[PDB]
Point group: C3
Chain length 270, copies 3
């Protein structure tokens, strides 16, 4: 695998928010998508631009305690400080004893572990979360990737009834990364589309018995993802995704997957 180096910044944002960015003043919630192939090493030159301690902690990937991002393992970052975190990944294969070592590939996420509490409750609430995708050799690559985070009662820390919306063309291969944070369980639902409940969100072939779903229960720090063919067997349209917990959809935990015809039109909606 390849050795990669990136910079990452934690920054305070308007309305008491906090975000990660690849450049100063370009912090976003969710944070930037990090994509790796199994075997790749990533060195993250992390700068905490804030006035409180902050950290970077990742799910799924290989890291040593020196890159835990915790007070326990003295790997958080002082205010205005810098730390180089290292994430490693590995491909699957048989061990010496004939057991199968699972690879790093999957839909994962990174977040703060020290803002507000020693579990990053305040950091997470304020927006310090982002997606990580680790791909296996031969994995099907998409035309676009969209990240949806159910953070307490908000989506991507947007005000209620505020999307986000995602645009595609009929036939586009669209990947979704779906992360949950905070206090509450949710159920993720997408109209007119469906996926497999497995590593890639896609059945491997006819021997894969994974349930095909369009609704999934998720809790804090769950991550999954999938790919769909936009509008496959259903056509162009305003295709809602929403939390299916009835009070949550009613309070505006809803967005649109806007699937246009090749001619740029979409069947008239609202």
């Amino acid at each position: 695998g390849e050795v990669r180096r990136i910079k990452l910044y934690a920054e305070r944002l308007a309305d008491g928010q906090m975000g990660y960015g690849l450049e100063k003043g370009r912090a976003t919630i969710p944070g930037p998508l990090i994509e790796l192939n199994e075997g790749d090493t990533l060195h993250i030159e992390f700068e905490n631009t804030m006035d409180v301690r902050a950290s970077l902690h990742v799910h799924g990937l290989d890291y040593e305690v020196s890159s835990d991002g915790t007070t326990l393992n003295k790997s958080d970052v002082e205010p205005g400080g810098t730390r180089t975190y290292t994430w490693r990944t590995h491909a699957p294969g048989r061990r010496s004893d004939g057991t199968w070592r699972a690879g790093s590939a999957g839909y994962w996420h990174y977040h703060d572990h020290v803002v507000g509490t020693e579990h990053g409750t305040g950091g997470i609430r304020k927006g310090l979360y982002g997606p990580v995708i680790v791909r296996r050799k031969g994995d099907v690559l998409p035309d676009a990737t969209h990240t949806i985070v159910f953070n307490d009662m908000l989506i991507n820390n947007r005000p209620a009834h505020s999307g986000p919306n995602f645009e595609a063309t009929v036939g586009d291969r669209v990947e979704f990364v779906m992360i949950t944070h905070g206090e509450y369980y949710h159920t993720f639902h997408m109209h007119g589309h469906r996926w497999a409940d497995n590593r890639t969100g896609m059945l491997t072939g006819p021997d894969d018995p994974s349930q095909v779903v369009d609704n999934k229960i998720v809790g804090p720090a769950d991550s999954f993802g999938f790919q769909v063919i936009a509008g496959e067997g259903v056509g162009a349209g305003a295709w809602m995704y929403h939390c299916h917990v009835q009070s949550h959809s009613d309070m505006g935990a809803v967005g649109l997957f806007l699937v246009k015809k090749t001619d740029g039109t979409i069947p008239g909606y609202e």
Copy 2:
């Protein structure tokens, strides 16, 4: 791939509830079981007999936005109004891009999307939900199918501690369709029986690594199903199923899977 047609009616019942039915005054909660084979197209000639806007929205199956059953897609039904909803299904197969297209087959459900709120909160609460099963070629068919819906704190909108109960005989292949709605997470548990956490609820063979379970966390609009051999390795008896969230079972989210001997008898129990 057969093209089929049914009539469906939304009706107000007693205790203010609301139900789907195949005939006028025959509405049930849950709604009627709709069963399709992959490839089938179903045209639902729907009539809203109620004095409020209602709709039909489906999980899992192929439909165009004109059959969304939402206000967003101008697909709900005015009071007394009619609409033909079209559901399509497909078999699995190889795409030209070399990927495997997942089929429609599964345990699915349909429900209202406009009663009370633009997400059907009032309709779902009052009973406008029912099961849909899409079968793959070669799928094993059961002796009977039973639908269990955890709707907020009730089962099938029954009052607390009033079932439903389902009866079978030892050896019967019994299918359960398990749907959840409303506000709360649940855990579905059955005494004396277990199933696979996969598409059909049954392991394909010794090369299927799916967890074998008797307890499953479910949230609103989750659906799964399974088939068991009634009493297999455990015998006839009153086999409780219940939510395993302790306050929920204590409040009466409990029913009985009554498995009889081939002589029609059951070991004595005290409900």
Copy 3:
């Protein structure tokens, strides 16, 4: 296909608790680990030493209604009474209808079903739960097994912020049994390690599409397990496990998987 016999006692414990034990005055919370191979029968000579009715109910395994442990089937135990419960297990096999009968193998649990309520709400709250593992022929056996029960807001009925901690050496094959009870949903997370969402928690091979996860939503009476190679690809250290529901980790639903180097030392303990 071994017939096994054990004695089990239900007893009141200090601090308003109740537990199962293999010997009088030796009750623990969780109760003793019961391990069976598919085909084994277990006869449990159960004695209720308490002043309230109590029972033994099991998930997953084969039992007749006479061993349900319920009020419904009159198979609980009066105060000071004794009853033999029988649990059976079976190997998988091909049915005469051509379908595959799922075996008993898996991560399971037993608990009371009649203390406090006819669903055992009081018994479970006070500590009457324990793990059951049923193995399939050829299953990989671990160096150690550790049971983590999320019981309402507690782990193993320990007071908040009280572990438990589990020690291993790098390269040990360590098995976790993860059981949930009570009123609340949880998300189980382990730093530095991951497992397969399937029967054994280990991918069978390259043909297994199971998601690889480090975070799993669980609710009352859910049970799963897995094995990890301690420190595999991540090294020695204090590896936190916790509930990832943020208020739960903040209130102390946390422990340590203490992974020692071959020499005995743990980095960050100097």
